Design a protein around this ligand. Structure first.
Ligand SMILES: Nc1ncnc2c1ncn2[C@@H]1O[C@H](COP(=O)(O)OP(=O)(O)O)[C@@H](O)[C@H]1O
Ligand SMILES: [Zn+2]
Lengths: 169, 573, 229, 78
């Protein structure tokens, strides 16, 4: 076996920029990786399965290049519902010009290129070396929730479940 | 032979009269004593010092390396083992085994050569070769000295193995099967852990296409790397190698095209005026310095002053920024040109190849494909500028993969198996023509060139140039051609001086104007050649830094932002 | 030519046998040999920390001893058979034909080496790029990712032959035994796989991790041989 | 056996018994000659809880229980 992008990222994270340009042969394989964490290959008489335990983080531009406020959101993606359903925390970072928001981002970026520090002075972020250890240590835990919040979830789910029926139409 | 000892003594006298080499060895020994990692047994000897002390020994090394360098090797090894006590018994018997290698530096004179200038008259001599590394092989150790032990006797006997591929002089063929019995007939024991090994690798240095003559087949040389310098350069590196250009095998003398296998036993690897400085700095003090360097960009081509200005700024380039977080920031500027033909599109594109210190001119393979993986056209562009014509002819794979090179300035191999990251610190300039034969100004460039906005907008400056049917343009554009029926070398020195000796930095005063103009651009709702995003803010920083390169100042001033903003609006309006 | 290398195996073998018998957990390794004698254990896992502790105990008492810990790391191939000889000398035709045990070593723990003020090299995780030819014959630790795993293959070490003319067993066509050598007629050698020495063998390729690779290069690979149980 | 596979040797009246694509149960001897592990095939084959089954056979919720048992992690979908 010669490991590709997904197989190498086993027990890791795979970033896929420009995801909207992916072909059907690319995205169809993504479904099995997203859903099953495995890759099944049946070629030249070989029938094997590969471990594909990966976290998929995809960032892509809108289908029509950009977003205008008059445009509906679903028209700005080339992806069907099945892929969007397999994603979680599906973000949509629209850019809207604003004299009070572009000013902050411009000031943030211009300080990054001016000095070797983040613009914030009251907060110092954790260095990556310490971040890696804490994340690794945190990853070792296996929390289990209580039955009280277990009943809470089924109420909040129904709350969110019923709303989308009105929202979609 | 007795003369061998005299030649050894000359190197001992050479070391005595130049304390710098031996005190450096003592400093190395002290460093090794403090760690008792261990530094290798190699020092560098300047040829100029050897020439000034003993020309014959210096000339002897160059002309007869097999008869002059081993005397130097023995002299250095003897001095190293005798300058101090080497007190540790067990460690001395192993660590001091390694002979002390030599390396050469300085002016080579007639022997300063290239793979093409190198000829058979220079064979069996020491030469310095400058070229480009094409490919390398796996590092493997060379057996030097073995140690034998008989169980019935309890004493050690050692055997050496030498061959012409590492030995300067052609010794009697040593290699054979490993022995099994000693002189007494007792069965010997193979002590793997007490044998001495030296790593070995062969590289292929080639004459650069930058200097190769037209219509002639290439010249290349095989270089052997040993011991510590066995891995010093990667494929594509511009390297300077000093070694013994030596032959191997036989040219069919025993048992037709077969020639003697000439190659270089490399022993040293170095990867690659005042009056000019007094001229570059002096001429920059006039008030109109920037316009002078914009005119000298293909002066026979009329008009297109702003694109010439943009090309010059691209040549100067910005400053890639790195942080303690490990971040890398874009510092290169990319330009794309669009419109109807017959407007000197390829003429200026050709001119860039004739001006930059390093440039690659190709056409729409771009990335590394598969195994060592071949270096693509964009891969070979590191630290250079890329000139691509027929930019519309890019395939689907090229169009989707160029995104990383355009912005991140990195090339990432993610093919089946090997994964690696390759530097792509290159500025990209390209030109394109409308598919439908003629350009339509009533429609946006995305609707004409058919390249997606996600690709067109990645270029910092997008120029749409169209020859109007106006007679006044036709008069000047024809008269300038008919009229054909500060120097360029100085300009190229100016670019060489500016890109290396000055690194401008930002200042809040420039930020006061740069942020203000970007805020205005985001606020201005008028139609423009590209929708304003944060990329323009980075472009302004690069353009202002690029102008500071021209002014030869470590800081940034108001005029640097004023020019950067003005030109950016020109490419947008 | 010959040179007097200051490596006296006679002193070391005395130290190895002394360490085997005297070093308490009764003795740790003698108890292991008792387990091995009753076939309870197949692999003898020599701990270099145990030898280092033994040297420390010897040093603090003022008793003279050699630096056996460093010697084992430097020439680990030779000491593999020496420890077997000491073990065979104290366990409760060539001996290898009947040895049912396999010998292995585990490196010094960095906590113990730092505690005893020594620069351990055995346990240092090394990438295949850092593995030069100078470290040939040394005991080293390689850190990387496995890419290929060869299946289990038998591996012969000593081929055993039988001669019908004299009945002797020859261990490696015509019998070279003393009876046949003196006699004018010599028996034909026939291979016997039952008495031959066989071992389980596999080969695995290790490859560098991503952070170990300098920019612009390719992740090299190294070959690992696995033997025994 | 699995995608591994090893070579087998067949002798005498055991020929004309196996063709490509068939499934076989093998009883044989494991050999090795220089390493070349192979099987001296000695035979070739090509083709209390009974009351506990009856106790489930005659029950009334048989179909529902079997259907439910297949996917305990999946609700309903009878
Ligand atoms: N401003 C100009 N000054 C001088 N020559 C020009 C100018 N504009 C166009 N030309 C001439 O028009 C020709 C067209 O070349 P070019 O436009 O680069 O080809 P293409 O349109 O195929 O890219 C060139 O040979 C050049 O000499
Ligand atoms: Zn016999």
């Amino acid at each position: 076996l010669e490991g590709g992008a997904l197989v190498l990222a086993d027990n890791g994270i795979c970033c896929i920029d420009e995801f909207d340009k992916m072909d059907e042969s690319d995205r169809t394989a993504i479904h099995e990786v997203m859903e099953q964490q495995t890759i099944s290959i049946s070629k030249a008489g070989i029938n094997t399965t590969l471990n594909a335990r990966t976290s998929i983080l995809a960032a892509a531009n809108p289908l029509y290049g950009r977003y205008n406020p008059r445009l509906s959101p679903l028209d700005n993606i080339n992806l069907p519902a099945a892929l969007l359903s397999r994603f979680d925390i599906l973000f949509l970072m629209l850019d809207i010009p604003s004299r009070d928001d572009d000013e902050k981002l411009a000031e943030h970026v211009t300080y990054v290129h001016m000095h070797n520090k983040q613009p914030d002075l009251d907060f110092t972020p954790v260095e990556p070396s310490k971040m890696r250890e804490y994340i690794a240590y945190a990853k070792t835990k296996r929390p289990v929730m209580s039955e009280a919040v277990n009943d809470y979830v089924v109420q909040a789910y129904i709350r969110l479940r019923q709303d989308s029926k009105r929202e979609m139409d | 032979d007795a003369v061998f000892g005299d030649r050894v003594r000359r190197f001992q006298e050479f070391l005595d009269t130049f304390t710098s080499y031996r005190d450096s060895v003592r400093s190395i020994q002290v460093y090794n004593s403090n760690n008792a990692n261990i530094l290798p047994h190699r020092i560098i000897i300047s040829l100029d010092d050897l020439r000034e002390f003993d020309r014959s020994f210096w000339s002897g090394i160059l002309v007869e390396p097999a008869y002059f360098i081993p005397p130097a090797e023995k002299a250095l090894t003897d001095l190293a083992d005798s300058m101090d006590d080497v007190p540790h018994p067990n460690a001395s018997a192993v660590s001091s085994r390694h002979p002390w290698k030599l390396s050469f530096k300085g002016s080579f004179g007639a022997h300063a050569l290239s793979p093409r200038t190198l000829t058979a008259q220079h064979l069996n001599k020491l030469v310095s070769v400058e070229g480009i590394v094409t490919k390398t092989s796996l590092v493997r150790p060379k057996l030097i000295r073995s140690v034998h032990y008989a169980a019935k006797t309890g004493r050690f006997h050692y055997r050496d193995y030498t061959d012409a591929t590492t030995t300067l002089t052609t010794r009697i063929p040593t290699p054979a099967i490993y022995p099994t019995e000693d002189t007494e007939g007792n069965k010997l024991t193979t002590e793997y852990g007490y044998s001495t090994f030296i790593d070995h690798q062969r590289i292929t240095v080639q004459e650069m296409p930058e200097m190769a003559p037209a219509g002639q087949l290439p010249r290349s040389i095989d270089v052997i790397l040993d011991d510590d310098l066995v891995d010093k350069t990667k494929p594509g590196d511009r390297v300077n190698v000093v070694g013994v250009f030596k032959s191997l095998g036989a040219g069919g003398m025993n048992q037709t095209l077969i020639g003697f296998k000439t190659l270089i036993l490399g022993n040293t690897v170095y990867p690659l005026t005042d009056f000019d400085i007094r001229n570059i700095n002096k001429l920059s003090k006039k008030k109109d310095i920037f316009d002078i360097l914009s005119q000298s960009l293909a002066p026979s081509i009329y008009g297109h002053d702003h694109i010439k200005k943009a090309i010059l700024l691209m040549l100067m380039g910005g400053v890639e920024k790195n942080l303690e977080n490990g971040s890398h920031l874009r510092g290169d500027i990319n330009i794309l040109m669009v419109g109807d033909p017959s407007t000197a599109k390829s003429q200026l594109l050709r001119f860039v190849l004739n001006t930059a210190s390093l440039a690659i001119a190709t056409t729409g393979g771009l990335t590394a494909a598969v195994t060592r993986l071949e270096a693509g056209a964009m891969v070979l562009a590191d630290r250079g500028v890329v000139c691509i014509d027929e930019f519309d002819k890019m395939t689907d794979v090229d169009r989707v993969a160029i995104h990383e090179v355009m912005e991140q300035q990195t090339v990432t191999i993610a093919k089946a198996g090997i994964h690696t990251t390759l530097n792509a610190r290159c500025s990209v300039i390209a030109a394109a023509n409308p598919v439908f034969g003629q350009y339509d100004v009533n429609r946006d460039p995305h609707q004409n060139i058919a390249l997606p906005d996600s690709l067109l907008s990645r270029f910092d400056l997008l120029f749409v140039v169209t020859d109007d049917i106006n007679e006044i343009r036709d008069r000047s554009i024809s008269e300038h051609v008919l009229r054909t029926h500060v120097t360029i070398p100085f300009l190229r020195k100016y670019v060489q001086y500016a890109k290396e000796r000055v690194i401008p930095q930002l200042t809040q005063e420039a930020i006061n104007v740069i942020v203000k103009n970007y805020t205005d651009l985001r606020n201005d709702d008028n139609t423009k050649k590209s929708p304003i995003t944060a990329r323009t803010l980075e472009t302004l920083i690069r353009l202002a830094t690029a102008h500071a390169k021209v002014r030869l100042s470590k800081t940034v001033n108001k005029v640097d932002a004023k020019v950067a903003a003005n030109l950016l609006r020109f490419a947008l309006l | 030519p010959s040179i007097q290398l200051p490596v006296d195996y006679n002193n070391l073998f005395n130290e190895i046998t002394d360490f085997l018998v005297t070093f308490k957990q009764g003795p740790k390794y003698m108890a292991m040999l008792q387990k091995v004698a009753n076939r309870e254990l197949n692999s003898v896992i020599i701990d270099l920390d145990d030898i280092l502790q033994y040297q420390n105990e010897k040093f603090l008492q003022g008793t003279q001893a050699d630096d056996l810990v460093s010697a084992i790391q430097q020439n680990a191939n030779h000491f593999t058979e020496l420890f077997c000889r000491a073990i065979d000398n104290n366990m409760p035709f060539p001996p290898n034909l009947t040895r049912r045990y396999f010998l292995y070593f585990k490196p010094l723990s960095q906590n113990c080496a730092r505690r005893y003020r020594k620069k351990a090299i055995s346990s240092k995780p090394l990438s295949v790029r850092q593995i030069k030819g100078d470290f040939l014959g040394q005991l080293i630790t390689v850190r990387g990712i496995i890419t290929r795993v060869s299946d289990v293959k038998p591996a012969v070490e000593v081929i055993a032959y039988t001669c019908d003319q004299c009945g002797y067993e020859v261990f490696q066509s015509e019998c070279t035994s003393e009876e046949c050598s003196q006699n004018q007629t010599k028996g034909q050698l026939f291979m016997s796989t039952r008495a031959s020495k066989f071992s389980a063998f596999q080969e695995c390729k290790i490859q560098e991790l991503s952070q170990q690779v300098p920019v612009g290069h390719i992740p090299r690979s190294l070959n690992i041989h696995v033997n025994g149980t | 056996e699995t995608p591994h596979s090893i070579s087998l040797c067949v002798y005498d009246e055991l020929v004309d018994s196996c063709r490509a694509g068939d499934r076989i149960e093998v009883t044989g001897t494991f050999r090795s000659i220089p390493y070349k592990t192979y099987v001296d095939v000695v035979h070739v084959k090509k083709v209390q809880d009974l009351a506990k089954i009856r106790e489930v056979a005659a029950r009334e919720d048989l179909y529902s229980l079997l259907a439910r048992s297949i996917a305990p992690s999946i609700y309903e979908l009878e």
